[PDB]
Design a protein around this nucleic acid. Structure first.
Ligand SMILES: [Mg+2]
Ligand SMILES: [Mg+2]
Ligand SMILES: [Mg+2]
Ligand SMILES: [Mg+2]
Ligand SMILES: [Mg+2]
Ligand SMILES: [Mg+2]
Ligand SMILES: [Mg+2]
Ligand SMILES: [Mg+2]
Ligand SMILES: [Mg+2]
Ligand SMILES: [Mg+2]
Ligand SMILES: [Mg+2]
Ligand SMILES: [Mg+2]
Ligand SMILES: [Mg+2]
Ligand SMILES: [Mg+2]
Ligand SMILES: [Mg+2]
Ligand SMILES: [Mg+2]
Ligand SMILES: [Mg+2]
Ligand SMILES: [Mg+2]
Ligand SMILES: [Mg+2]
Ligand SMILES: [Mg+2]
Ligand SMILES: [Zn+2]
Lengths: 115, 307, 110, 223, 153
RNA sequence: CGAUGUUGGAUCAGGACACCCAAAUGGUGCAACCGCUAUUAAAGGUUCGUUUGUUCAACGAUUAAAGUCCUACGUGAUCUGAG
């Protein structure tokens, strides 16, 4: 349950992701019709005084059984084409993501650990 | 004459109460097991299946809910409906009821004799059944008609099918506008006085009255609704239990009315079903303990491995 | 909100002589086979229960005299006796209350 | 060596007025399931590894290892939660015991801890949430009677996911002397409801039911 | 919505309810017969039935002792529970208590009143309702039926 | 004028159609995708935020769309009181 004005943790290695800033990266607008984001959902993100798009990787809110539930709200910085702007993603990721290949292909390619 | 109130128990001694109870229960056993053999008595003529036909229904008892799994991996939740004692009671012909379809009146589970009324007890007396708790009326095409006094079992529905379940919903009593309708309230904190729930404006300035449909506080929930398009998954033949899909309106342990789905997409499904109804007598072959749908993972099984 | 007009006496008679505001006649009254007073069928007889209450009180008084204080209650069962009675072998080893009145008709010896 | 029967907690039916038949049915089915998949004895705090059927992985099997945080459910629906940290990411999964997607359950460590449920490992220092993914199973003699590990835990600074200091929780597993002021401990005690322990009527009885369903289990082994 | 709520609300809150039942219980164990508000007596009856089953558990059981400690207020009674009440209920599983409706209180609040009692106490017996005798006309007509259920078997 | 308590919000909306979306079509300086026009249709819809007391307005992000109005500039014996 990520929604407007949530503070999120950028998982991948990135220019924007890693480098510090005074304001934590915030969620502006989720691209679902319900205002609520879940795993494998697009997001608009305000980071370092600019907007970038993100993909929700994992979140603290419970979900269907046998789905992983995470201790932080995790995102992957993402461009307009669906191209991950990170080189690789260390922290673990839902296996359920592999259900959608079409969109998440290039993002799942750089993922290390699946849980 | 000031005639005093009286109940069944009142004048009996401590000796005769167990006796009367024995008397009644024993004649109940006799009566139920007597009508246990429908096909050898005087069965009404059985007709073959016509295309626009519709079957009798059942009166079941909502047990509880259970999870169930499908071979694709998905989880479902199901409602157990046990058929307890279910008999067709009377038959109203086509021209005497709707002028379109005939009506069969079906009884629900057995109740005590003592707490019904002279009229009703007479109605069952001439029948030879014990009194039923609930009684509903089913619309039936005249080729589907059965003989009053006939048992109905859970096998009447085959796994994979769709049904309609009607019952009284859970009574939530006199309710506010937020629970009954789903109005937002007014904000809690910002200086609102005594308003945090109330309906707000109920009408227009000029109209000078409040319209008849106007949503307002009032009774919620003891009332009849119907669930449609319910898949039936599994049938337990020993205890007469139907496993239907999802939630069925009413409280658990309440009586319920099942029939085939009248939804359009399922209209002609009836042809493959045991029709006038099911008859455990006639086939002279037992059914398995359980009948399942082909997508259902069974209580014992290979324990699915994707490949 | 203030009433716009006085309610007429006809209207008001309609409200308060309505069947639903009338006292409803109780049909469960009967006579107690014992004293022949009145009782509802689902309730103990007031009169008889008063006999029992008085006697209970007297017994408790006199078993308050046998207890020298607030917190002393016997560690044994007790039995109540009347004029011209003696504890049975089954009833001995128990606290004994001796009352002056002859044993009441309703009260059995047990 | 004296043997006290261990009953998997999901054979205990809930307290509601639900018809006793439903439970008989459910139990027949989960006993049917127990013949295929072997479900071990275990408690909260014991460490398990679970093998799953996953369509989307390369090997269709998916292993997960973690401590059991809580068991809850009843009948077919009963679940357990496994907690483990990977790379610094805390992760929990909630498994349904009787789900056919579960291949094998393996107890790597049989253990009790001081509390019937520890969800508070969410708020503890990460060590207590971490275990080696490959760590090998460890075996015991029964007469050790499922050893109760007594370990108090260190906490992150408040706030916590829940208030664990409150009497409703009954947590001996936390080390509170290091975390809290004496004043906060008097504060937590204003929520104490002493009378609850002596409430009699509030207490749920089992033993007749358990005798019954144990009888049922034996009758399931025989056939 | 009150669905499946077993306990009624009394007193100043949940705790006050427990202490109300405390006093009522203590009163019942001391005097063995008491009369109170029909609702409160009904509420009590459960606890008064379970207390005897904690008494059956014996003096030595610790749980039963701190249970009887909390519930019985005047400590003097705790022996009487274990050494008088609990022994005289041995055979019977649940039959400990008799609860009857008394006529409404004669005070102006006109309450609904009950008497509650431990069976086998030493007191003048309550005027219980008696069933009709067997000699009564209708029962005599039933005896016929019975003797013909014997004759036909 | 021996009182018909007034702006904007909240709540709940009733209605019109001079239609913003959804449906069916005519014309195009309509190839296709977009559009621009006109006809018919009012059952159902018509977002979330930054600043303003604000209605308007500007701006951020969106939406199938973020309609124009009437109802004592609907609605204070339901609320608000910034103006
Ligand atoms: Mg800036
Ligand atoms: Mg209700
Ligand atoms: Mg609110
Ligand atoms: Mg104010
Ligand atoms: Mg005020
Ligand atoms: Mg308030
Ligand atoms: Mg008018
Ligand atoms: Mg929280
Ligand atoms: Mg009160
Ligand atoms: Mg004026
Ligand atoms: Mg005037
Ligand atoms: Mg409207
Ligand atoms: Mg028009
Ligand atoms: Mg259009
Ligand atoms: Mg409209
Ligand atoms: Mg104007
Ligand atoms: Mg206005
Ligand atoms: Mg205003
Ligand atoms: Mg006001
Ligand atoms: Mg007004
Ligand atoms: Zn009398």
């Amino acid at each position: 349950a990520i929604q407007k004005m949530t503070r999120v943790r950028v998982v991948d290695n990135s220019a924007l992701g890693t480098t510090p800033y005074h304001r934590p990266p915030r969620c502006i607008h989720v691209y679902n019709k319900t205002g609520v984001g879940k795993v494998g959902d697009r997001i608009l993100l305000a980071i370092r005084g600019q907007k970038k798009k993100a993909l929700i990787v994992g979140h603290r809110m419970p979900g269907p059984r046998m789905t992983p539930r995470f201790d932080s709200n995790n995102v992957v910085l993402l461009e307009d084409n669906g191209n991950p702007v990170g080189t690789r993603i260390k922290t673990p990721i839902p296996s359920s993501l592999r259900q959608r290949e079409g969109e998440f292909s290039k993002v799942l390619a750089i993922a290390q650990n699946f849980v | 004459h000031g005639k005093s109130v009286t109940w069944w128990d009142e004048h009996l001694s401590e000796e005769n109460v167990p006796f009367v109870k024995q008397l009644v229960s024993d004649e109940n056993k006799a009566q139920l097991a007597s009508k246990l053999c429908p096909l050898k008595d005087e069965p009404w003529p059985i007709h073959p299946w016509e295309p626009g036909s519709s079957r009798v229904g059942l009166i079941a008892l909502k047990l509880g809910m259970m999870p169930l799994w499908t071979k694709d991996g998905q989880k479902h939740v199901v409602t157990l409906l046990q058929v307890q004692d279910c008999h067709v009671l009377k038959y109203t012909p086509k021209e005497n009821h709707n002028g379109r379809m005939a009506a069969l009146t079906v009884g629900g589970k057995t109740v005590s004799h003592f707490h019904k009324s002279a009229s009703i007890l007479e109605f069952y007396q001439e029948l030879g059944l014990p009194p039923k708790q609930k009684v509903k009326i089913f619309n039936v095409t005249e080729n589907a008609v059965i003989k009053p006094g006939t048992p109905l079992y859970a096998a009447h529905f085959r796994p994979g099918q769709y049904v309609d379940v009607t019952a009284k919903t859970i009574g939530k009593g006199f309710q506010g506008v937020m629970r009954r309708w789903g109005f937002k309230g007014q904000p809690a904190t910002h200086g609102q006085t005594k308003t945090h729930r109330r309906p707000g404006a109920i009408s227009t300035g000029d109209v000078a009255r409040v319209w008849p449909g106007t949503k307002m506080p009032g009774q919620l929930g003891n009332i009849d609704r119907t669930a449609f398009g319910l898949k039936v998954w599994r049938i337990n033949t020993k205890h007469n239990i139907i496993y239907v899909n999802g939630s069925v309106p009413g409280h658990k342990n309440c009586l319920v009315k099942i029939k085939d789905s009248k939804l359009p997409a399922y209209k002609d499904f009836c042809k493959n079903l045991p029709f006038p109804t099911y008859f455990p007598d006639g086939d002279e072959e037992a059914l398995p303990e359980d009948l399942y749908d082909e997508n259902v993972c069974q209580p014992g099984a290979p324990s699915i491995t994707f490949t | 909100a203030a009433p716009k007009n006085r309610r007429s006496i006809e209207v008001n008679r309609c409200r308060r002589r309505n069947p639903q505001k009338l006292i409803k006649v109780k049909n469960n009254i009967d006579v107690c086979p014992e004293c022949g007073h009145l009782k509802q069928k689902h309730i103990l007889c007031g009169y008889c229960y008063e006999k029992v209450r008085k006697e209970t009180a007297e017994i408790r008084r006199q078993m308050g005299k046998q207890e020298g204080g607030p917190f002393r209650a016997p560690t044994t069962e007790t039995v109540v006796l009347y004029s011209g009675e003696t504890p049975s072998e089954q009833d001995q080893g128990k606290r004994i209350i001796e009352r002056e009145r002859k044993r009441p008709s309703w009260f059995t010896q047990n | 060596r004296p043997e006290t029967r261990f009953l998997s907690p999901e054979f205990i039916p809930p307290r509601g007025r639900t018809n006793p038949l439903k439970f008989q049915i459910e139990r027949k089915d989960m006993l049917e399931r127990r013949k295929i998949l072997h479900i071990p004895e275990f408690y909260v705090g014991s460490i398990l590894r679970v093998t799953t059927a996953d369509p989307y992985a390369s090997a269709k099997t998916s292993q997960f290892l973690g401590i059991c945080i809580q068991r809850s459910g009843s009948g077919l629906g009963a679940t357990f939660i496994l907690r483990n940290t990977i790379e610094g990411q805390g992760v929990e999964i909630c498994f349904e015991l009787y789900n056919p997607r579960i291949q094998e359950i393996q107890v790597v460590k049989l253990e009790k801890r001081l509390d019937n449920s520890l969800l508070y490992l969410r708020d503890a220092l990460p060590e207590y949430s971490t275990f080696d993914v490959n760590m090998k199973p460890i075996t015991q003699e029964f007469n050790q009677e499922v050893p109760v590990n007594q370990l108090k835990v260190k906490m992150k600074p408040k706030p916590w996911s829940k208030r664990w200091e409150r009497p409703k929780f009954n947590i001996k597993g936390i080390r509170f002397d290091l975390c809290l002021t004496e004043e906060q401990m008097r504060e937590a005690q204003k929520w104490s409801q002493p009378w609850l322990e002596f409430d009699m009527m509030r207490e749920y009885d089992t033993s007749k039911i358990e005798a019954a369903i144990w009888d049922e289990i034996e009758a399931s082994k025989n056939s | 919505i009150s669905h499946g709520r077993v306990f009624r609300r009394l007193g100043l809150g949940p705790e006050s309810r427990i202490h109300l039942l405390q006093n009522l219980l203590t009163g019942l164990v001391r005097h063995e017969r008491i009369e109170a508000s029909w609702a409160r007596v009904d509420e009590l009856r459960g606890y008064a039935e379970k207390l005897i089953d904690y008494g059956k558990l014996g003096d030595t059981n610790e749980r039963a002792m701190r249970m009887a400690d909390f519930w019985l207020t005047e400590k003097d009674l705790i022996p009487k529970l274990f050494q008088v009440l609990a022994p005289r209920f041995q055979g019977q599983n649940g039959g400990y208590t008799r609860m009857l409706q008394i006529p409404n209180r004669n005070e102006q609040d006109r309450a609904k009143m009950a008497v509650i009692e431990y069976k086998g106490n030493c007191l003048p017996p309550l005027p219980l309702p008696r069933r009709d005798s067997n000699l009564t006309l209708l029962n005599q007509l039933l005896q016929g039926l019975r003797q013909d259920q014997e004759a036909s078997s």
